[PDB]
Amino acid sequence: SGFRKMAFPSGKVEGCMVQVTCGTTTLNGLWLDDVVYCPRHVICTSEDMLNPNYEDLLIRKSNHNFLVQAGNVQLRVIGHSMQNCVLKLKVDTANPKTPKYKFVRIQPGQTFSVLACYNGSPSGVYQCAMRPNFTIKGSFLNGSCGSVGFNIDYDCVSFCYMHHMELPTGVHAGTDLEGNFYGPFVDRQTAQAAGTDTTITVNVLAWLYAAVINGDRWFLNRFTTTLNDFNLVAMKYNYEPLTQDHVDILGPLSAQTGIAVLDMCASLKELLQNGMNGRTILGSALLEDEFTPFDVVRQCSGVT
Amino acid sequence: SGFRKMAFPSGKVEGCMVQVTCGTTTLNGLWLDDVVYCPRHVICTSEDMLNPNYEDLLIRKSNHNFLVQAGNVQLRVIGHSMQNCVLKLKVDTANPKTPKYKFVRIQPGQTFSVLACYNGSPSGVYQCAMRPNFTIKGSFLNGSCGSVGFNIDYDCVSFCYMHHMELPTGVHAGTDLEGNFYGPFVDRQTAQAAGTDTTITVNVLAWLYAAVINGDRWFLNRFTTTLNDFNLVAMKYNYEPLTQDHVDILGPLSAQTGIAVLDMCASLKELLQNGMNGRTILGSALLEDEFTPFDVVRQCSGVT
Numbered sequence A, B: 001s002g003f004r005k006m007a008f009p010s011g012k013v014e015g016c017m018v019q020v021t022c023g024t025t026t027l028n029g030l031w032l033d034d035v036v037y038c039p040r041h042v043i044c045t046s047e048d049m050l051n052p053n054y055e056d057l058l059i060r061k062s063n064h065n066f067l068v069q070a071g072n073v074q075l076r077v078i079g080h081s082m083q084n085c086v087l088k089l090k091v092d093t094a095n096p097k098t099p100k101y102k103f104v105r106i107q108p109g110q111t112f113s114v115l116a117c118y119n120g121s122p123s124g125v126y127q128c129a130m131r132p133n134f135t136i137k138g139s140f141l142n143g144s145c146g147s148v149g150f151n152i153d154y155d156c157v158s159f160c161y162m163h164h165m166e167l168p169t170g171v172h173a174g175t176d177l178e179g180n181f182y183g184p185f186v187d188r189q190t191a192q193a194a195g196t197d198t199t200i201t202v203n204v205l206a207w208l209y210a211a212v213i214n215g216d217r218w219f220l221n222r223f224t225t226t227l228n229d230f231n232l233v234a235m236k237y238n239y240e241p242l243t244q245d246h247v248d249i250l251g252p253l254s255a256q257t258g259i260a261v262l263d264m265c266a267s268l269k270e271l272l273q274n275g276m277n278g279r280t281i282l283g284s285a286l287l288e289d290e291f292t293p294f295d296v297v298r299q300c301s302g303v304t
């Protein structure tokens, strides 16, 4: 039936996007109830970004200096405060389009959808993973700051990411909705290199199970391995070490396909050592790691 | 700044999805104004699908036999008609969430977003291309029929695809919103093999330009080629022949990067003849063909 890098339907999040302007700077904000959330660097000019004292910069700003526009209507700002790297603008009107929501701080290796926005307007939606080094490989241009990452469960949106910065290497860094950066990144125009980015082993295995479920079985072999043997191979190829918690989460996929987790590890071991030999798996020539076991079950079962 | 397989924000389409039930069969419908559009095979049982006479099957059905549910509210059906492979159910209420829309029949090689649905509820959104053989490589399970493909321009949704069938090979076939199938496919449970699927050359070149724009330049070489020389290579590797119309559409990308189209063709020629030698381009180990020149410009400029 096919397997695609699917994002959640973005409707509930589109109705939350606003444009926030402070002085010369314009970026995106997230309007939930009577609060607009946005990156605190909205108060900076490019000149301030080298070494900004956000507390001192925010002191020269009043409620009337933050211009919030939802589509074509202007929101009245009645309060402002800084929480970590985000500003919280209290407005006099609750967003009538506020969905049921939560703020969650996701773990590395977990996935989420991103609704890229510019001037408070959505341009597109794509599926991302929080890398083990706490960066995301997204698609963001200047003006995209404040665009959010999220997951959906039935009718509840769990916001997990707010975009803040592009690193000199082209990868992206941002915060949870409490303004805490994922990783060691600071909201300063300083050289900040992302550490070693490893491959999310449990996600590659989940995607290998998805491949078997959809007919791609050429990589299955007559071998097995042990967690310690597999992890010697995973270390050599900069793969996250596989644990019993990882084996446990792959249980439903192992149950559906009848392929024991350690047997799937032996297929992955041989793919790591030998490569794909010019072949593909689910339309890909590399081992895909941005699908969790939960994503595979969801897509393969039709959860709406 | 990064490059992702981005889909359009799906909000405007989510507000159009309904569940349509006829007898034992449940599938998705598209509610625009006072009309619900859905695949005509909603009137079939699996037994009928072998060789259905849709005209005779529809004769045994009245307005009250089509149950249309939008979320939790029931729509009253006051008319029904068959247009090609789609049924048009006239309801007594115009969808208050109907966006500005058009029905368009796209060309092969063009891209579009798909909002996969089950029981009238959205599960996810992904970007697709209409293959040169008029199939799409999507992700659809039973119950997904009636899910639509679309493009957005400012505030106007151009619906181009409605999902109808999974071929025995795992690829997907469907219609435009007038019920005309893309390709030679019929809505019958018969062996229908998709013809030879070629690579969309103009899209690969557009994606090569996107790679250069984002720093991936290892594949650039000191060579050039001619359209006739390049097309001898394209035929050998089952690539669509490149034409002057294709060169013309790549003009803005050639203007921005300063790399002449025929010089980019020579890079592609060498990638075809030599492979990637274990390297990647925009996180991919194969030549990507599901991004049009328009998609690359849009994503690289921040069009919302």
Ligand SMILES: Cc1ccncc1NC(=O)C(C)(C)c1cccc(Cl)c1
Pocket (backbone or CB within 6 Å): A041, A049, A140, A141, A142, A143, A144, A145, A164, A165, A166, A167, A186, A187, A188, A189, A190, B001
């Ligand atoms: C230009 C761009 C592109 C994609 N995402 C983001 C950006 N923007 C940035 O990175 C800027 C605004 C310049 C920045 C600089 C230093 C620290 C922080 Cl928090 C932010």
Ligand SMILES: Cc1ccncc1NC(=O)C(C)(C)c1cccc(Cl)c1
Pocket (backbone or CB within 6 Å): A001, B041, B049, B140, B141, B142, B143, B144, B145, B164, B165, B166, B167, B186, B187, B188, B189, B190
């Ligand atoms: C099961 C499924 C999965 C993904 N997309 C679609 C389907 N469904 C089908 O293909 C069915 C309904 C069985 C079918 C059969 C023959 C012709 C037509 Cl038009 C449709």
